[PDB]
Design a protein around this ligand. Structure first.
Ligand SMILES: [Cl-]
Ligand SMILES: [Cl-]
Lengths: 520, 519
């Protein structure tokens, strides 16, 4: 008899009741019993952070299912509204449980007689809610017993150390079916502000009833204040809220004043279809998507009424002008900058940037950085040099360009279409100055689904040479599984980078990673 | 100009909103639908109407293909726990008139329209105590845009709308969905509506599914709390999700009033469909189990499940199960349930199983017809069982008769011609001349009356033993798309009951006077 066990590098949410530590598949005969397994927690793990460890039985696999798998269903949902934190009772039956205080070796037992075929068991770990976001969970499963006889385990995936995280927003929270399109900044007071679409009815893009929400943390992501609606258009002009959506937020901190700016696209009318195919040439809300700004002058607690800046930057011939989701920046000289994207008169989308030299009162947009590109993020790679990292519809890899004149003229970067692979998805890029971090060196930090197939392997990558190279040694995989893929980075302090992203375990997931783990 | 559509869809007495009419108006920016008139029919009881509302629902996206009468589904029958009131996300109330209603209802709006196709709709709310036999005839004789009358181009109109009750709707009692209706009327006049409780999704077995019963002692006006008639929870320690029981069929033993429900329990089989995972053999680990429960107190309490698999299943068959809906008591006291099995050649076949000893022992002889699945049975004449079958060849119901409890079968002239279908469950019942107001023997049939999709849920009557189904003796109940299953039962001498999956609720009950069908 054989036992196949897989561990994936997926976040252990501190706010979840269950977290999939290990999944086990056992091709067995009728009557077989997994009488015992041993979980050996690592010596460097802080045992006092662990609330519980559980063994679950999840029945048998269907003969009709194609391929080989490690579960018959997703054990813990990130989709079912209001039921995303605890193991789905429909599909898993608890065999055993060890609760706090945990010792270094944990033995879990079962009396379950298996059925003939592929049987599934899995191990759950529960962390205490106050657990440090920097805590790591190293474990192994050195022993397993079937019918009281030792069985050697066949490993089909193993991780050195697991990371924790917090599901800031989950399916169904505050009556919203979904949350998407992450943006993250750290204010001058060290406050973390996470921005996103509040996708009330479904996970689809505009047009739909969508508002801009903001979650605020004053303790580096350990706890998040109740969600605030930063922007909404409700029943503007008498149209239903479903035909008055605002979405795809981008957030920036004016670092000279601590004023926080969020830009989003308001779509008006356009039925229940996607706004990408219904925003048309013109300027009015009836004709085209509206570029809207809100500001906070109290560290993200309260937000101004929306400010319509469409007329300042949209050409009438364009079908659609909107921000690139995620974040914007303050340049060294105090210039505020947001990435943008527009569908031109020839129906081709293009990435670029808009900026303000007067603290966000007036905005300017020059020329496109590259044709057939969409979502992009901007970083000041060197003083007065903006680097734009772009979602490229050609597929396979991020396009990269720079400008020294705020986007009048652009230069393709050596790393463009070669250094950073992608499946055509949003990606995050930030600059970290040597003075402001523990490595004492300038850094670019990038995050995306690190693959050309689907959206998985959410990874943070660091560059020490202005984005020319991204060494494998200086990367950290955070989410091996499939998700919606968008992410946004921001330095929490001098020693830690924060990532606010769409993961396999939560719609808005926050994680903290030490820079010492990335570099060194 | 202005295009308006009325569909023959049930007006639920238990909803807050129901779509009376849908309007699409191609307009210029700033156009105002300042007034519309609803003229309620002269025979309508105005005291049953709680309110009528005018809604504005924005404009259509230019990117959408074809012509439509709404940008979204205005009142959901799918969103768990949000299926009774118009979705606020997509409709803005313009005007409202509340009880006591007047025969003529003027509804106004001040909304400046956008350039494009603008949507307006009219909602009707009934009072919850409204008679299930109440009919609502209306017209919209006038409409004004920019203080000028505008000719209305009709793209669908109904003579009279029927009411109904959404006995089960998405999210009720924590179940995402409900499917597979079965309906009987006991010897006490009690209606018992059986269905799958599909807790996690609308998918078939395998899944966490129980058998539910909704009981009514007032001809469907109100329904008692759901009773779980059968469940296997965590049998043998497996999850409930790998222990579903479904596709119920119910019958009244008319000799004793004992009520019997037969369902299929599937054990193990992952999270895939039991149709592809029930295997040859006899144990729960191998194959779907044919389970029975009984009620000796008019459907109020139910016995522990009784496994009858060994009495009627051949080991070579992949899957033996009941034909969902209902069974019968024959004139001589024989209990009969339709059945279906996938044989060793992997071909499904309809048939019937029967009991001569009040449900203690069951017997199953020969298949009625090859490559058929769900069927319903009725004693068309004393001693003659007529089986009406879902046929995989497509397009039409197969019909066969037997005089020896399924040892031999005779194809009926009506077979594969008289009753069109899209390959879906259909209900058949017999009504004796002495037991109904017409004084004639009747066969009553219900299915999605179409060969394309599942729609136009229609009750058909036959006065000639199922040879003909004259268009004049039919009643369309649900013009829109739905899951399509239905089950018929006479409520009393004058009215037929239908318990079905409709476009407006997972379990919909309606009552229809036989005088609406015949004459
Ligand atoms: Cl075996
Ligand atoms: Cl649960």
């Amino acid at each position: 008899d054989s036992i196949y066990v897989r561990e994936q590098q997926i976040p252990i949410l501190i706010d979840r009741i269950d977290n999939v530590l290990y999944e086990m598949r056992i091709p067995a005969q009728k009557g077989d019993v997994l009488n015992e397994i041993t979980i050996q927690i690592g010596d460097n793990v802080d045992l006092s952070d662990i609330q519980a460890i559980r063994l679950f039985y999840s029945g048998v696999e269907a003969p009709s299912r194609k391929g080989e798998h490690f579960s018959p269903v997703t054990y813990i949902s990130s989709h079912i509204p209001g039921n995303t934190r605890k193991a789905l009772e429909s599909y898993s039956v608890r065999q055993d449980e060890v609760t706090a205080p945990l010792s270094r070796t944990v033995k879990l037992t079962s009396k379950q007689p298996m059925l003939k075929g592929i049987n599934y068991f899995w191990v759950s770990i529960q962390m205490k809610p106050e657990t440090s976001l920097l805590a790591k969970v190293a474990t192994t499963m050195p022993n397993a017993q079937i019918n009281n006889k030792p069985i050697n385990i066949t490993w089909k995936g193993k991780v050195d150390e697991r990371h924790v995280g917090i599901g800031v927003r989950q399916a169904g929270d505050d009556g919203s079916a979904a949350f998407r399109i992450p943006g993250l900044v750290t204010t001058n007071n060290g406050t973390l502000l996470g921005v996103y679409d509040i996708r009330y009815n479904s996970s689809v893009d505009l047009q739909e009833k969508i508002d801009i929400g903001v979650s605020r943390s004053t303790d580096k992501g350990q706890t998040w204040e109740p969600m605030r609606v930063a922007m909404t258009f409700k029943q503007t002009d008498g149209l239903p809220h479903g035909q008055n959506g605002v979405g795809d937020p981008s957030i920036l901190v004016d670092e000279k004043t601590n004023t926080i700016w969020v830009v989003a696209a308001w779509t008006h009318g356009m039925g229940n279809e996607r706004a990408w195919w219904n925003s048309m040439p013109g300027m009015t809300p009836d004709e085209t998507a509206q570029l809207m700004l809100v500001k906070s002058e109290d560290d993200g607690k309260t937000w101004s009424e929306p400010i319509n800046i469409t007329s300042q930057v949209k050409d009438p011939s364009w079908y659609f002008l909107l921000q690139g989701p995620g974040r914007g920046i303050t340049m060294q000289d105090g210039t505020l900058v947001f990435p943008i994207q527009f569908i031109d008169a020839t129906r081709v989308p293009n990435a670029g940037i808009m900026y303000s030299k007067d603290r966000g009162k007036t905005w300017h947009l020059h020329n496109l950085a590259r044709t057939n590109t969409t979502e992009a993020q901007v970083a000041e790679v060197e003083p007065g040099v903006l680097m734009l990292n772009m979602r490229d519809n050609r597929g396979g890899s991020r396009a990269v360009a720079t400008t020294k004149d705020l986007g009048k003229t652009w230069t393709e970067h050596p790393s463009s279409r070669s250094a950073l692979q992608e499946s055509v998805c949003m990606a995050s890029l930030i600059k970290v100055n040597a003075k402001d971090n523990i490595t004492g060196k300038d850094l670019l930090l990038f995050s995306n689904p690190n693959t050309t197939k689907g959206r998985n392997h959410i990874t943070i990558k660091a560059s020490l040479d202005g984005g020319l190279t991204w060494p494998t040694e200086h990367q950290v995989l955070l989410d091996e599984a499939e998700g919606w893929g968008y992410s946004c980075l921001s330095m929490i302090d001098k020693e830690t980078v924060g990532i606010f992203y769409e993961s396999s375990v939560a719609h808005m997931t926050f994680q903290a990673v030490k820079l010492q783990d990335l570099i060194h």
